[model samples]
Target chain A: MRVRTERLTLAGLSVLARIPEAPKALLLALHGLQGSKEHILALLPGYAERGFLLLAFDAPRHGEREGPPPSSKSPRYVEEVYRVALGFKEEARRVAEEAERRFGLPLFLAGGSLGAFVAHLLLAEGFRPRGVLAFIGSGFPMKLPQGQVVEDPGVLALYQAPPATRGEAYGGVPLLHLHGSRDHIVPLARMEKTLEALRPHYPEGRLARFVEEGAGHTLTPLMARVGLAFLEHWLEAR
Target chain B: MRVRTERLTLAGLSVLARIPEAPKALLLALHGLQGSKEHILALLPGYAERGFLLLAFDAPRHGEREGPPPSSKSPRYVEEVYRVALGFKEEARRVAEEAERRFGLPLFLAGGSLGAFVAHLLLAEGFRPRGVLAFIGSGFPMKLPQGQVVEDPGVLALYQAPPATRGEAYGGVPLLHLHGSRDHIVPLARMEKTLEALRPHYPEGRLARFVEEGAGHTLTPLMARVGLAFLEHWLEAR
Candidate 1:
């Protein structure tokens, strides 16, 4: 069956999402920095194959959307501080509300990279999802990771920066923290340190690590395999 | 002064470009892998700020433009190898042509990352820009610099892979190459190897290298400093 798509301009931001076949559940996707809402449709056939409705949008200054790049690279917009990141998370909530109203399905937060940060923000704000599948994120590293951000100052700004105040409020709602061990961009060591910080609150088997032997800054075939498995296990249609 | 922009749709593609105050002078701006026209705008503020019109768009399956993601692992749209990437380039040409008709200025091409590859493809196919500024690109670690397919089997199959029978003709253009030694994404070593291949054809100055004190895959502040200076020297718009 052909999935339906409608384009809506929300505050000058265009939001696009897949319409469901049987109208089951909504999987709201958030992309990384400099990426658009349309990213990860490549990763969607799995979710679509699994019968979940997927919804996504290009955040401000990303993808095809138009907006000035985030100003004030200050501590507010700092990679780790994540308070300013909540601005987009707030928008994600609006998009989620729209998706829920439009499709009448349970919304799930699916995020990648910076999108992962937004996912945490959503959880903190009390907008609950059916479940969260954080592909490659939400881990708060005590130290710097590598690649994607090569300069030490950038890494320092992100790693040394304190985690958001609300970071601890969102206990596990079937959260899956998937990270590639070989992910040069977000190093395994950094992820381990982050895992240590949040180890107290995670659900059983919720935080599984799939180590792609040589993957770099992107999703690997292995990550996809685990992602599909987790989606199958946690995101079953009602 | 307000900058003029022309929007044209071709082959089910949406293209937007900055129109030169005059007629005919337009440089096609191709963004890097997973980058869009807005990205180029952020880079060429000097040109846009000073009113030297630019033409840029999201490549097929990139940014917010609607197109199926590359099937499986191949950047090539399922089964159709050259046809898809080539067709996308043609769409860019059409946009450039529209700018030429409207503005009457000499056309040029400046694309970074994947856009640089597209610009090189256009130059090889006889679409010579007055001058080309290629940021952070290398012909690749291939034996045949010609339009030969470069096969480096890695996660970056779509990105690093060179098309068949491409690159040799690229040596003939007035090209400016900018790269950073600290660029971990596209290793400086690999970039240098590709640069060595073109040394026989282009002058050393033409193959400029702006090695930032610390920069990575994306553009750095240093690039902005030297990039404007480079464009001022090369693009006669000043």
Candidate 2:
């Protein structure tokens, strides 16, 4: 009816939101690396039209929260990802809680590349969204074309700790992975491995994946169509 | 000084127990689909000498508990796997709790194909063994080379349940995967995918994998050595 963009701030992170007339789910959309909240809002507002109150936010180092830029292959990059991901967990929870409190809707997640990594990290830390769509992202530390794996200590402390040290946290939500068969950056092989690793743990009937031929490591129209339909299906069935 | 094999029963499943004096860890090993505890006993008794109170057991329809044999492509095979895995959850817990109570040692898991699937299911149900070694096994339902995926409703009910309904069961443990590059039955691609999927959630410094040039879908000596060394390293570090 009106040409307007919904913008807000949650826990100090600037957010751009889409409030549909009758929102069915509280969708949190995260932009890929080197992207901004504005870019995601611009790129994926169709979900809002399809009855989701889509929410997008600037990741720790992008858009409003930008810090000193860290080179991809540097230790700083690893540290940044660790600090950003772990730091956003509480804030993301706060955002989801607030929106669900207001809208009475369940949560769903849509993320691209770096944002997808952050989303997976949050899932492991126990954010059980109704469904998730990870586009153009492979889990674990981002694999560089050069094959250098950068790891940070803070993440090591959390990931490697004994169960007694860290109580129970899980990441077994239903997920749809949209990828390209020819993705060289985050090779299809890595994604296949990641999917296989988590297949047994995934909630049954909650997983769908497609690797499109001749596609690159970027979101595509088919991905959007596939993703929203996936969300709609799970919302009804779940 | 000991030429004798020690065996017992935990719950209703017949178990083969090897209690080593001054045992440092409690290891529960599960046999593959067609194999028995006796088979695993003859093949992998070295763990007992290496300080694990090693216990092997017959799966639901294998060994002494054999039921109506289901062909690989049949629904009953799927049902049996589900029934066996879900049924084993509580009993496995009882065994672990009992052993940990008695020996005060940490728990570790070693499993073959069908047993590995069961192990992964248990991990999702919140079993946090110190470290896990899965040889000639994989997560998710056993994929058929014929490409037939049989589904069962009992498993669907649990897997597709809402997060709130399930509280939280986790599968984030340090793990090592041993597989064959040329495994035709449980193809190497599948294992790679499984490992990739779990790579992020796993505790750091607790993962190692290897694929021999020309190996089939059976246990190999290299796998045993690789698996044990992995277990010993994590047992000490964790």
Candidate 3:
């Protein structure tokens, strides 16, 4: 019912948290590229009403954080993307650990678009939460669009990392991925490719896929409802 | 303050109109590609507050209109795009004549994205209104992102016809074009090309342009405000 906002310094990033009183669970939600925590904060109320605590903050160079903007073309832009993704993974682990110590509740990670890409990277890098809900992000071997190519070694390592390549690290982790069939940003081809890659790794019904027909690369109210349901179900079942 | 909704059959399409009580002006508002009139109906209140009657309808192959679904890859889809554009011109002319006959007020043509492109076609075809407000539309030669190409003769006529080529017919028609600088669907390059083509034809300031920073190919409340202001100014000037 009550809300508190505070700032935290983690992984050289300014993290903003909106903590609600006496929550049943914790969610680490991330926004899309060029989007700040405020972009996805709209979902906080709904999750809070369902007895969940939400902690969100800006990615590098976004929101109140002081950094350069994300880019798809420049080598530095790809570096920044990798840096934020890795940094957010660490931030999520820190927050999840603290929340478990204090509130002793299940932890969930949710992200949209670029945030989803980062979350997928974290999973490949072996940082597992109870469950993950990723929307509008592709699971294919990460590659920038045709025009914007990345050549930096550090950024390339993360970008080239495939979700299917992580065997035991990603096993048994339930994933709910929502995609738009007509999405131009993360095209259907990439989504299908990723789905094929991960389908064999998970047991039946563990990896859920939902495609919003006729929708472009945009989030909807339906996405929020489904994502919350996925997290809620995972929390209860586990 | 009063509102009424009515349906009409025009040019092989079902048209919908939302009329405000004792309107001062009339607008033939068109929606984006693959979008229904209901998509932009949110602008109704804003336009109504400015004392205008709004007439809208589904484009061919969109909404309730009886045609195949919109596509860019199929030749038939290209035909539908052209067919609706040509059909909407006749519809606008009919509505403008009727509204002027009944209300004795100015008539304006407005469209966003695909709608804007169609509205421009109407203007090029000599359906002049008091003014025109085109949002999220580009002036470049019409082409889809990939795979969809239009080559049919009838569709090609309008697709190839540029507003800059209309000479006296398009001259002196006040045009207010709003585009998103970062729009991927209709890139800024296309918008700039269109601006270059049309700028020399109109008297200085007759053709106005506003580029919304960081906005993609989507409409926003800011566009509505600026659009209404453009129409209001045109209504007041003469």
Candidate 4:
């Protein structure tokens, strides 16, 4: 019942990790905008209790990285921001490989808000995880709840396209999507649009969606349990 | 004789990997400032020829990341840049772990200039590799060739401290440190001081230092051969 804390750096960013002795699997979680790796701390004990090693790091311009924040003021800015997102997708694969090497365990990816958004992008970009837990993620170009439109032509073309169009690149990946019905940061309609767009690409029952009645942008313990249930089923299956 | 390419994500960044079908070792090479994963491409085929898998990634604020570049205009800027250096040290550890998992080969870390500086820090911070290959790295806080002093207090306290102060944390980690005797960016005197400080901490024959006569700041094929010789010794010893 011992837990060890490891401070790791990957791709020149600080990563905070919690590895339980004899972990059965590894989960790499991403935090949302303006959030640091600490944002995922609440879920560590839960995941560790389930015999998982959990790893997290601050997104660029956030946490100890404290730099110029991502901007959407110009077309160039938007392009660069999406480029960084693509970078996140690449980083996830390496982390998964590292985790697999270190623990010899299955790998899973999850995140909320911006974190969740990147998870979906990884799947779209053709990374296959045994299972993915995406809470409040989007498959389409995002429209922030504050009335801001993120309509970068590149993002729009890439993300707004139907998942079926991406074809088998994203096929066969199992995903558990959870969102609050009342969430505004990544509003319900957008989540629905995102999932619906990808639904046709996935086999029936591969994509599991749960809309928490009246829940907001924040994830709840109940939602955590549900996501864990999904993870346990697939993780145990292998 | 087949070489596999794996695109991995680590700590939210892109990592390009070239793994030999029957790799005997893995080399995680770090790119210099303003360089991307492509910077290390030349060394890949050579390492592969020697039956090693190689991995490379862009430093933060470099390559496709296209984020705000690292700056030293303000004390805050200096702090953040050094923080990123610490991040690189962390990334190397995970990369080593992932490489061990993927290829089950002996692992080595190598880089030049800023990359070399980071390799030293990893050793200083207690990441024990089978061996490290560092070229043109500094042991003390750097003063650029033009006399610009990097005056971050935190960096000074941590990286600038004499290696003897850090003691056994770096002890017994075999290192092959190469420097150009005429290099100005990380001057010969600083390199001497760095080794002198660390020499006492290492046992006889553990720390190997080589100075290239009249060479400055760049890695040549000859230098590469010398490093490979060092790498071969320990990797074979294992």
A7-87: candidate 3 lDDT, tens digit per residue: 655444555666667777878788877788878767444677667777677776778788667766675565567667667
lDDT at residue A213 of model 4 (Cα atoms): 48
lDDT of 4 by residue, A146-179 (tens): 5345556655565556333453577567776777
Q: What lDDT score belongs to each candidate, Candidate 1 first?
A: 0.57, 0.65, 0.68, 0.67
Model 2 alpha-carbon drift over 4 Å, by segment: A1-3, A73-75, A144-152, A158-171, B1-238
Candidate 2 residue-wise lDDT at B208: 40
Task: Report the lDDT of model 3 for residue B206.
Answer: 52
TM-score to true structure, per model:
0.42, 0.47, 0.48, 0.46
Give model 1's TM-score versus the native structure: 0.42
- What ranges in model 1 sit over 4 Å off? A9-12, A67-84, A141-168, B1-238
Error of 3 at B73 (Å): 4.2
Which digits, one per residue and each the tens of the lDDT, describe model 1 over residues A154-213? 445444543333446666565655564356555666554544554455543343333332
Best by lDDT: 3
Report how far off residue A178 is in candidate 2 (Å): 1.0
Better of 1 and 3 by DockQ: 3
DockQ of each: 0.01, 0.01, 0.02, 0.01
Question: In angstroms, how far off is A158's CA in candidate 4?
Answer: 77
* Poorest lDDT segment (10 consecutive residues) of candidate 3 chain A: A140-149
Q: Reference contacts recovered by each candidate, as fractions?
A: 0.00, 0.00, 0.00, 0.00
